[PDB]
C-alpha cells in the first residue's frame with residue numbers, strides 16, 4: 041500500500057506467502073492473510089495460480105460465527121474467479137452458501153439481492169439432473185414470492201408454459217430501469233460486455249429449452265415453422281440443430297431438400313410388434329379386473 | 345505445433361530458407377484443418393514439395409485422409425442432403441466430392 | 451520444531467492437491483523415512499501429523515504380512531485396504547518397518 | 551509426452567551428454583524435476599530446476615575411499 | 620452334480636482386469652527386441668498356422684539379460 | 689542343437705513372409721546357435737600357459 045499495489049507488489053507477496061505457514065498458521069489471521077494475495081493475482085489477471093492458493097482455504101470453515109463482515113464476503117471475489125469461463129452452476133451453489141449470513145444479519149436489501157442474484161442464472165447453467173433437482177429445492181420457498189421472478193422460475197418449469205422469446209423481452213424491460221432494488225439484474229444482464237455474452241447465452245438457454253419439448257410432442261416438424269417458433273433464421277436453426285446432434289444430446293435427423301425434419305426413434309420390426317402384444321396383454325388383463333368388479337357390484341345390490 | 349518449434353531452434357536457423365517455409369504453411373493448414381488452405385499452400389510452392397523425392401506420396405496420403413476426416417463430421421445432422429450444399433460446407437468443387445463419395449460407398 | 455513441518459507439507463500438499471499432479475503429471479510422492487533412535491520420536495510425532503484431519507493411524511506391525519509365500523501377502527496387502535477404502539486419504543501408520 | 555513441460559528449454563542438451571545413464575534413472579530425472587517445481591509452488595516446470603535434478607541423480611560415485619583408483 | 624472347480628490356493632494369475640497397467644507403445648525404442656520377443660510368444664499364440672505352414676515347432680523359452688534397469 | 693539350427697533357419701523365412709529356405713539361411717543360423725565362452729582379459733590364460 042505504499043504505491044497501492046501493482047505487478048511488483050503481487051510478486052512481493054507471492055514470494056513471502058508460506059513463510060508464516062513456516063511459522064504457524066493462525067486459525068484466523070493466517071487465513072485472513074493467505075486469502076488476500078489472490079485478489080492481487082486477479083489484478084495481474086492470474087487465474088490458474090489463483091485457484092491453487094484458494095484451495096488451501098477450504099478446510100478452515102465455520103469461523104464465520106465470530107466473523108461479522110469478512111468471512112463469507114471475501115468469497116464474493118471467489119465468484120470473480122469462476123466468473124471467467126463458464127461455471128454457472130457452481131456459483132449458484134456458491135450463492136446458496138453465502139445465502140445464510142444476510143439472513144443471520146437480518147437485512148432486507150443485501151439479503152434480498154442475494155435472492156435476486158441466485159434466481160437469475162440457475163437458468164444459465166446447462167441442463168442436467170443437477171439443475172433439475174436444484175430448481176426443485178429452491179422452489180417452494182417462503183421467501184421467493186417477494187420478487188416477480190417467481191413467475192420466471194415457474195415459466196421455466198416444463199411443457200413450454202406457452203412461451204416466446206419476444207414475450208420474454210417484454211417481461212424484461214424492468215431489469216435495467218425499475219424494481220424494488222433492481223441491482224443484480226443490472227449487474228448480471230445490464231452490463232455492457234459481460235451482459236452481452238449473457239444476452240446471447242440467455243437466448244441460447246431458451247432455444248435449448250424449446251428443442252426438448254419439441255422432441256417430446258412432435259413426430260415431424262417443418263423447417264419454416266421451427267424457424268418462426270425459435271424467433272430466428274432457418275440457417276441459424278440449422279447450426280443449432282447441428283451442434284446438438286453431434287453433441288448426441290438430442291436425437292434428431294433432418295431432410296433438407298424438402299425441409300421436413302423428424303423426431304422419430306429409429307424403427308425396428310420386433311419392437312413395434314412387441315408393442316402390440318403389450319397393449320393386448322394389458323387389454324385382456326384389465327377386462328378381467330373389470331368383470332371381477334362388476335360381478336361384485338351386481339352381487340351387493342341384488343341382495344340390497 | 346512442434347514443427348515451428350524445431351525451425352526456430354538454433355541449429356535449424358543455420359539452414360533456413362524456402363523449403364522450411366513450405367512446411368510451415370503446410371503445418372498451419374493441417375493445424376487449422378482447412379482443406380483449400382492446404383491446396384493453396386501446395387499450389388504456391390510447386391518445385392518445393394509437389395515433386396516427390398519421397399514426400400509428395402506421403403502428402404497425398406495425408407490429404408486424402410483429410411477429406412473423409414472432414415467429410416464424416418458433416419453427415420450426422422441429416423438423413424438426406426443435396427450435394428451442392430455439402431460442397432458449400434466443405435468449400436470445394438462438387439465433381440471431386442462425387443468421385444470421393446463414390447469411393448467411400450465402394 | 452523443524453521436523454513438525456518438514457514432514458507436514460510433504461504429506462499435506464500431495465493429498466490436499468492432486469490437481470497439480472496433472473498440471474505436470476506424476477502421482478509418486480510416497481512419504482519420508484523417519485530414522486534415528488527409538489526415543490519418543492517414532493510414536494509421538496506421528497501424532498503431530500495427526501493435528502489436521504489425519505486420524506486413521508490403525509497400525510502396521512511389520513510382521514503379519516511378511517509370511518513367506520507372497521500369494522497370501524498380496525491378499526494381506528488388500529486386507530488392510532478394506533478399511534482404507536472406507537475413506538479419503540486414510541493414513542496407514544506403520545510401525546517397525548524394518549524389525550524382525 | 552505425458553508430462554506438461556511447456557517451455558523453450560531444449561532437452562537434447564542432455565541427449566548429447568556422456569555419463570551413460572541406465573533407463574530407470576531417466577525416469578528418475580523427469581519425476582524429480584516434477585517435484586522440484588511443485589514443491590516450490592509452480593503450476594508448470596520452468597526447467598531451471600531440470601539442471602539440478604540432472605546433477606542430483608548422476609552423483610553415484612559414493613565414496614571409493616580415493617583408493618585403488 | 621459337479622461344482623465348477625477353483626484350483627485356488629497359490630494364486631499369482633494376473634488376470635481379471637488387473638494384469639496390464641501399460642500399453643505396447645510405452646517402451647521407448649527397443650525395436651529390435653520388441654520385435655524379437657513378439658516372435659516367440661505373441662506370434663505363435665495367434666498365427667499358429669504360419670509355423671505349421673513350414674514345420675518350425677516354434678521356440679519354447681527366451682532368456683533375457685542385461686544391466687539392472 | 690541341430691534342432692536349434694533347423695528352427696532358426698526356418699525362422700528367417702518367417703520374418704520375410706516366405707516359405708522358401710535356402711542354404712544361406714542355414715549358414716547364418718550356424719553362427720547364431722553356436723557360441724563360445726568368450727574368456728576375456730587373457731591374463732587368466734597366460735597365468736595358466
Ligand SMILES: Nc1ncnc2c1ncn2[C@@H]1O[C@H](COP(=O)(O)OP(=O)(O)O)[C@@H](O)[C@H]1O
Pocket residue numbers: 573574575577645646647648649686687688
Ligand atoms: N526403454 C525404456 N522405456 C520406457 N521406460 C523405461 C525404459 N527403461 C526403463 N524404463 C523405466 O525404468 C524402470 C525399470 O524397471 P525394470 O524393467 O523393473 O528394471 P530392470 O530393467 O532392472 O528390470 C521401469 O519402471 C520403466 O518405467
